[PDB]
C-alpha cells in the first residue's frame, strides 16, 4: 500500500573491509597541531605497515583554502589523504555546526581539487554513528561530515575516498583495518569499525498504541511549507491547542488565512513570532503555555535558509543557513528536557539520508537532527528524526531542481500520505524513519551515474 512503500531506515550490516591491501606512494595524514597524536601514530604505523610513505599535514583551525592549496602543490604525487580533523576534537561552547572539522574538511577538499592532487580523501570520525541502539552518538554535529561527504562524493568522485567511524579514543580498530579500507577492495565508502568487526551503511525497507495530539503542540516553521501541512494534520487529529512559531509569526505570508484554516479544521491556534536560535526567546515562549494545555509534542519543521546564491560551500555559510534548524533543535531539546513530551519530531531530509548534487548546504543540518534524535533516545528521551522525501502541494520551488528530483525518481508525496507515514512511525516509536517515494528503476541509475555505491545493496527493488 501507499504508506508502506514510503518506509526505510538506515542499518549497519557486517561487511568485508577488502582483502589484504598493499599501498604505494605517499599518504598524507591531515590533523590539527594540538589534537589526535595517538590516532595519527596508529594511522601512520598502519599505513607504513602496508607499504606507504606517510607524512603529517598539519592544518590550521579554520584555515584559508588557498594557502592550503599552495602547500598541497609542493608535496608532489600524493596517493591519498587521511583526515583526523574530527578525531580527538574539542567541544567548546558554540552552535553545533560552528565545528572547525566541518569547515576544514570542506577547505581541505577544495584545496585538493585546486591543487589537482588526483587522490581520494578519507575522513575518520569518533563514535559519530551508532551501529545499533546499544551505541551512543557522541557528538551529533560530526554526522554533518557524513551528510556533506556523501554529496561531495556525488559531485566530485575522485576527491572523496570515504568515511570511517571508530570508537572514540581507541586506535585498535583503525590499526587493524585501515589499510584494507583505503585499498578499497569492496566498494565500501561508509564504514563503522567496531571491536567485533566492520560494518557498512545500508538502506533497508521498514515493515494497539496510537499517538494523539494533546495539550499544546508546537510547530516551528509552522506558518508555511511542510510545517503548515503538519499544522493542518494536527488540527484534523484534534490538537487541543496549536502553537505555530516562525521568525515573522503572525506577519508571515498567509498566516492569518492559515489560522482561519486551522480554526475551521477544529484547532484553536496561537501564532508567535520567535527566533528559535535565541534560547532565551524560546524559554519565554514555553513559559507562557498554560497549565491545562501543557506542551506535549514538538514538531520542529524550521527549514534551512537559502538566499539563492551559488558560492563554494563553506562551513561558515552552512552554519548560518542551518542555524534555525540546528540551534533551534538544540534549544528545544535543552528546554523540553524535563517535560513529559509524547513526541519530539525533527524534520530531516533525504539530503542527509543519501544526498544529491546541489544539496551540500542542506545535508549537514539534517544529519545533525538524525544524530540528536539518536542521542536523545540513548538518554531516555523521546525523539523522532524523519528524513523526508519531497512533498506535494505546500512549499518547494517549481523549477529545474525540483523537476530534476522527479526526473531522478523521487516523487512528491501527498501531504495526507506523508502524515500517515509519520503517524505509523510515531506509533512504532521509530527513531530515524525515512519516508520517501522512490522509483528505484530510475533513481539507481541517476545515483550511480558517476560513482558506484553499496548503500542500496539490501533493497530488492534496487537489484
Amino acid at each position, epitope marked *: 500500500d501507499e504508506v508502506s512503500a514510503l518506509r526505510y531506515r538506515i542499518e549497519w550490516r557486517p561487511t568485508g573491509a577488502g582483502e589484504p591491501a598493499r599501498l604505494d606512494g605517499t599518504w598524507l595524514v591531515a590533523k590539527y597541531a594540538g589534537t589526535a597524536d595517538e590516532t595519527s601514530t596508529a594511522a601512520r604505523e598502519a599505513l607504513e605497515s602496508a607499504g606507504a610513505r606517510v607524512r603529517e599535514l598539519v592544518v590550521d583551525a579554520r584555515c584559508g583554502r588557498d594557502e592550503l592549496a599552495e602547500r598541497l602543490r609542493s608535496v608532489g604525487e600524493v596517493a591519498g589523504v587521511l583526515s583526523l580533523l574530527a578525531v580527538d576534537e574539542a567541544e567548546p561552547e558554540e552552535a553545533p555546526l560552528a565545528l572547525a572539522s566541518l569547515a576544514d574538511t570542506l577547505s581541505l577538499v577544495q584545496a585538493m581539487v585546486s591543487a589537482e592532487l588526483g587522490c581520494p580523501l578519507w575522513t575518520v570520525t569518533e563514535s559519530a554513528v551508532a551501529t545499533g541502539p546499544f551505541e551512543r552518538v557522541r557528538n551529533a554535529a560530526h554526522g554533518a561530515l557524513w551528510g556533506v561527504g556523501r554529496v561531495i562524493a556525488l559531485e566530485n568522485p575522485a576527491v572523496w575516498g570515504g568515511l570511517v567511524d571508530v570508537p572514540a579514543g581507541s586506535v585498535a580498530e583503525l590499526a587493524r583495518h585501515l589499510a584494507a579500507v583505503v585499498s578499497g577492495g569492496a566498494g565500501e565508502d561508509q564504514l563503522a569499525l567496531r571491536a567485533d568487526g566492520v560494518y557498512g551503511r545500508r538502506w533497508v525497507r521498514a515493515a494497539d498504541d496510537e499517538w494523539k495530539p494533546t495539550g*499544546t503542540v508546537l510547530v516551528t516553521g509552522g506558518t508555511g511549507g511542510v510545517g503548515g501541512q503538519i499544522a493542518r494534520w494536527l488540527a484534523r487529529r484534534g490538537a487541543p*491547542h496549536l502553537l505555530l512559531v516562525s521568525r515573522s509569526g503572525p506577519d508571515a505570508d498567509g498566516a492569518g488565512e492559515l489560522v482561519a484554516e486551522l480554526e475551521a479544521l477544529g484547532a484553536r491556534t496561537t501564532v*508567535a513570532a520567535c527566533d528559535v536560535t535565541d534560547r532565551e526567546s524560546v524559554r519565554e515562549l*514555553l*513559559g507562557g503555555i*498554560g*497549565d*491545562d*494545555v501543557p506542551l506535549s509534542a514538538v514538531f520542529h519543521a524550521a527549514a534551512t535558509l537559502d538566499d539563492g546564491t551559488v558560492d563554494t560551500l563553506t562551513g561558515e555559510r552552512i552554519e548560518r543557513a542551518s542555524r534555525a534548524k540546528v540551534l533551534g533543535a538544540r534549544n528545544l531539546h535543552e528546554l523540553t528536557r524535563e*517535560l513529559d513530551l509524547t513526541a519530539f519530531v525533527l524534520f530531516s531530509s533525504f539530503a542527509s539520508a543519501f544526498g544529491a548534487p546541489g544539496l551540500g548546504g542542506y545535508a549537514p543540518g539534517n544529519a545533525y537532527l538524525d544524530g540528536l534524535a539518536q542521542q536523545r533516545r540513548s538518554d531516555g528521551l523521546p525523539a523522532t528524526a524523519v528524513a523526508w522525501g519531497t512533498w506535494a502541494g505546500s512549499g518547494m520551488a517549481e523549477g529545474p531542481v525540483a523537476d530534476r528530483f522527479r526526473r531522478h525518481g523521487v516523487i512528491e508525496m501527498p501531504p495526507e500520505t506523508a502524515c500517515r507515514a509519520l503517524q505509523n512511525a510515531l506509533d512504532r516509536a521509530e527513531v530515524c524513519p525515512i519516508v520517501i517515494d522512490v522509483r528505484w528503476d530510475r533513481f539507481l541509475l541517476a545515483y550511480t551515474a558517476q560513482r558506484p555505491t553499496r548503500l542500496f545493496d539490501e533493497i530488492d527493488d534496487a537489484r
Partner: antibody
Amino acid sequence: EVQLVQSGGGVVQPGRSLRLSCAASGFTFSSYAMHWVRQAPGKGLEWVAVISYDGSNKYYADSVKGRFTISRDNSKNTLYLQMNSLRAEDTAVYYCARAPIQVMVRGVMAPDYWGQGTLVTVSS
Amino acid sequence: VLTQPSSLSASPGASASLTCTLRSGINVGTYRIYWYQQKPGSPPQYLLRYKSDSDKQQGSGVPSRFSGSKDASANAGILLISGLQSEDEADYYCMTWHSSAYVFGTGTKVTVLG
C-alpha cells in the same frame, strides 16, 4: 489599581442556591482568566473553579462538579459563581481571583491577584 | 495530592525551606508549583511559581529572598525564604494543576522563633 469587588454572600438554607458576583476594575477584564477559591474558617485554601478569558473553557473541582456553574459577563466586567444544592461543607469565605493576562489563544494559569472574599454560611 | 508540613519555625535571618510533596506515583518534575502567602485577615498573596530552572517566575513586587526550586529525591517543591524576617510569619500554600483542576497543598504556618 486592580480591584475585585465582591457581592452576594450571607446565609443560605441547606439544599438551596446562591449566586456570588465579582465586579472587576482597573484592568481589561476580558483578557484574564478568573478563578474562584474558598476557605472554610480556620481551614485551608480549596480551589473551586476557573473560567478562561473568553469564557469558552471552564474547569471545576470534583467537590463542586455538577452543583456549581462559573460564568462571566465580559460586557459588564463581572464574574459569577452560581452555587446549588449547598450543604454545610460549603460554608466558607469565597474569593474571586484573577489569573495573569492571557498570552495564547488557549490556556489558563493560577491566580496572581485575589479579592477580599465573601462569607457564605449554609444554615437553617 | 499536595502535602505540606503544618508548621515550620526558624530564627530571624535563617533560610526556611517549605516543602510541597506530591503523591508517590506522580513525578514532581513536570508540575508548575505556585506559592501563596496568607496573613491574618488578608487575602492570599501570590509569591512565585516554579516548574524547573527553565520555567519559573517571581511574583510582581515579591522580594527575591523568596525563591523556588524542587527536590527530586523528596518528590517535592520547595519555597525558600532567605533572610527570614518577622514580617514573614503567615500561612503558606502551594498550588498546582493536576488532572482537570487546580489543587492546593494543606498549608504551612511559619513562626519566627525567638
